[PDB]
């Protein structure tokens, strides 16, 4: 009994051992991938945002140049 | 020594697993914290981006209105 019981105990522990190491490896992989994918988006978004700020600043610059034109075209027209 | 061998191996595995179980638990727990934090950041950024796009839209409207208005003053001069 004692020997065989220890054998059954040993069989279970090894099976659970493998299952466990296998599963933790898979889940850790997925968690990691997810975090990687998210870190990438965050990164690409920051880049996208910088490009947007620039597009805005340039539009505003064109807009402020148009203001000068407008004001002068009116002053012209009184002629 | 084949019953001392099993009691030895078994008790070894039996605690190694207790180890893994406890360790992964905390690790996964932290993985989930990160993932959530990153998703929340992506959302906050998306919102901020949204706000910026609105501001950009108002400005673009103002600039186009100016354009139009200008074309006019340049015709009210072309005769």
CA B47 to each of CA A49, A70, B11, B72: distance values in angstroms, whole numbers, following the listed order = 12, 35, 55, 38
**Nearest-CB residue to A74 (from B45, B62, B73):** B73
Nearest C-alpha of chain A: how many angstroms from B48? Answer: 9
Distance CA A28, CA A36 (A): 12
Which residue of chain A is at minimal alpha-carbon distance from B29? A31
Distance CA B14, CA A16 (A): 10
Would you list which residues of chain A are within 8 Å, Cβ to Cβ, of chain B? 2-3, 6-7, 9-10, 13-14, 16-17, 20-21, 24, 27-28, 31-32, 34-35, 38-39, 41-42, 45-46, 48-49, 52-53, 55-56, 59-60, 62-63, 66-67, 69-70, 73-74, 76-77
Residues A35, B27 contacting (CB under 8 angstroms): no
Nearest C-alpha of chain A: how many angstroms from B5? Answer: 10
Distance CA B79, CA B71 (A): 13
Dmax over CA atoms of chain B, in Å, equals: 115
Cβ density class A43-54: b for 16+ within 10 Å, e for less: eebeeeeeeeee
Residues B7, A7 contacting (CB under 8 angstroms): no
Residues A65, B65 contacting (CB under 8 angstroms): no
Residues B40, A43 contacting (CB under 8 angstroms): no
Size of interface A-B (CB pairs under 8 A): 106
**Selection from A53, A43, A36 nearest residue B48 by Cα:** A53
Distance CA B25, CA B47 (A): 33
Using CA atoms of A69, A58, B47, B33 in order, give the dihedral in degrees to the nearest 10: -160
DSSP secondary structure code for residue B3 in this structure:
S
Resolution value in angstroms: 2.3
Gaps in chain A after residue (C–N beyond 2.5 Å): none
Gaps in chain B after residue (C–N beyond 2.5 Å): none
HSE value, Cβ hemisphere, 13 Å, CA-based, for A7: 5
User: Under 8 Å CB-to-CB from A34, ≥6 apart: which residues?
Assistant: B35
Distance CA B79, CA B67 (A): 20
**And the tokens for A46?**
């920051």
Distance CA B9, CA B21 (A): 18
**And the tokens for B48?**
């901020």
Pairwise CB contact (< 8 Å): B17 & A13: yes
Q: Which residue in this structure is represented by tokens 């064109």?
A: A62
The range of the structural domain enclosing residue B63 comes to 1-79
How many structural domains compose chain A?
A: 1
SS3 B77: coil
- The CATH number for B63's domain is 1.20.5.170
Q: Which residue in this structure is represented by tokens 């893994």?
A: B20
- Experimental approach taken: X-ray
């Amino acid at each position: 009994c004692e020997v065989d019981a220890l054998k059954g105990t040993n069989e279970s522990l090894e099976r659970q051992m493998r299952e466990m190491e296998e599963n933790f490896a898979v889940e850790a992989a997925n968690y990691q991938d997810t975090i990687g994918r998210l870190q990438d988006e965050i990164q690409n978004m920051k880049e996208e945002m910088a490009r947007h700020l620039r597009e805005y600043q340039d539009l505003l610059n064109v807009k402020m140049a148009l203001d000068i034109e407008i004001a002068t075209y009116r002053k012209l027209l009184e002629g």
